[PDB]
Design a protein around this ligand. Structure first.
Ligand SMILES: Nc1ncnc2c1ncn2[C@@H]1O[C@H](COP(=O)(O)OP(=O)(O)O)[C@@H](O)[C@H]1O
Ligand SMILES: [Mg+2]
Length: 383
């Protein structure tokens, strides 16, 4: 009937949904007013919390708050990747006939879900948010996936959509969606090379696309599976723990809720630092009855992650090399991921590309969703 098709960025740490309507794309904000919602699902005695409500209680419910499902989806339990990651997740992953599965306690009873089931919960929240905005039912959808996702991971993502009551029109690659967002898919009678630099919450991807006469071709990809904004937050944490230890003589490492409450403050300050040069850290009763009041400068923040930010260029060089291109041969540089909002990273990348201008007018964390929405409208036949 009507039901606008939506574009959904099913992210590792955050997801985003947008619709194309009347020539323009609108990225839908949630009930809390955020344009992206955490890819978190929590289980308690009384309820199943999803998104912001879920993430905002993780310090209390470590064992029953699920995240990083995108790292599990489509894989086997005996998968080396699963085995490694598994070691640092506060929730349990079990082996159900070769398939990895998350084990959580809900309403007193022990329950387990397949990665696909967790993702469908997040997708339900996105569809929900979309519907709340559109004031109409949403069925059709285009969901995005990393270019390196194999048939299994891709099917598992389609499955997650089906479970959530979404008719997935197509599963397109994330880098391809970011290009479409900026319109780099328009035919110009020439072959164009685009570099997608994607730095999100916990994954770093770099892909070189070649678009000719309308068709995309992934030339090369590179990055680091365990490099993201969360790593930057941690450096700040260690910094403040040592600060507190020095100024109060009490190490707070031991207290897991104090540490996580600090981390939450650091993530927020980090965001403020992308627009301001100083940020306040106000934490009442951080350890025992000690309030932790301090501040940090962008200069110090950059100091804390120097090597990290700098190392970002290594995967870029490799990408160029594998694609068999020189810096000069790349036509467009698109910034994707919430972490690309950091000034220093934008500087460092530009300097590397000898001054070339960065594509970044569309919020990097909303770019993929933006492109998916455009593509959804096309597939639905309304654009
Ligand atoms: N203003 C900002 N400065 C730095 N990092 C930011 C900013 N806004 C968002 N982020 C970070 O971006 C990450 C979210 O990236 P996003 O693409 O939304 O997630 P993902 O792709 O991992 O699902 C988090 O680390 C968040 O702190
Ligand atoms: Mg992202």
């Amino acid at each position: 009937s009507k039901g606008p098709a939506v574009g959904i960025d099913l992210g590792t740490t955050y997801s985003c949904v947008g619709v194309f309507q009347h020539g323009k794309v609108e990225i839908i904000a949630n009930d809390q007013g955020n344009r992206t919602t955490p890819s978190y699902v929590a289980f308690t005695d009384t309820e199943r919390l999803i998104g912001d409500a879920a993430k905002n209680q993780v310090a209390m419910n470590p064992t029953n708050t699920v995240f990083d499902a995108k790292r599990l989806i489509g894989r086997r339990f005996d998968d080396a990747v699963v085995q490694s990651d598994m070691k640092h997740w506060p929730f349990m992953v079990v082996n159900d006939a070769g398939r990895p599965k998350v084990q959580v306690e809900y309403k007193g009873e022990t329950k387990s879900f397949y990665p696909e089931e967790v993702s469908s919960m997040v997708l339900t929240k996105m569809k929900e948010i979309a519907e709340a905005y559109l004031g109409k039912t949403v069925t059709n959808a285009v969901v995005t996936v990393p270019a390196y996702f194999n048939d299994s991971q891709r099917q598992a993502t389609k499955d997650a959509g089906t479970i959530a009551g979404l008719n997935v029109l197509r599963i397109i690659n994330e880098p391809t969606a970011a290009a479409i967002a900026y319109g780099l898919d328009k035919k110009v009678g020439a072959e164009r090379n685009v570099l997608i630099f994607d730095l999100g919450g916990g994954v770093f991807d770099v892909s070189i696309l070649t678009i000719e006469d309308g068709i995309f071709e992934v030339k090369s990809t590179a990055g680091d599976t365990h490099l993201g904004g969360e790593d930057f937050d941690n450096r700040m944490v260690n910094h403040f723990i040592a600060e507190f230890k020095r100024k109060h003589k009490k190490d707070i490492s031991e207290n897991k809720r104090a540490v996580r409450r600090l981390r939450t403050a650091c993530e927020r300050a980090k965001r403020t630092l992308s627009s301001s040069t100083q940020a306040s850290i106000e934490i009442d009763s951080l350890y025992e009855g000690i309030d932790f009041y301090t501040s940090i400068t962008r200069a110090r923040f950059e100091e804390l992650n120097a090597d990290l930010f700098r190392g970002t260029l290594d995967p870029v060089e490799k990408a160029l090399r594998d694609a068999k291109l020189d810096k000069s041969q790349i036509h467009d540089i698109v910034l994707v991921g919430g972490s690309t909002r950091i000034p220093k990273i934008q500087k460092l990348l530009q300097d590397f590309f000898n001054g070339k201008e960065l594509n970044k007018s569309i919020n990097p964390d909303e770019a993929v969703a933006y492109g998916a929405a455009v593509q959804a409208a096309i597939l639905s036949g309304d654009k």
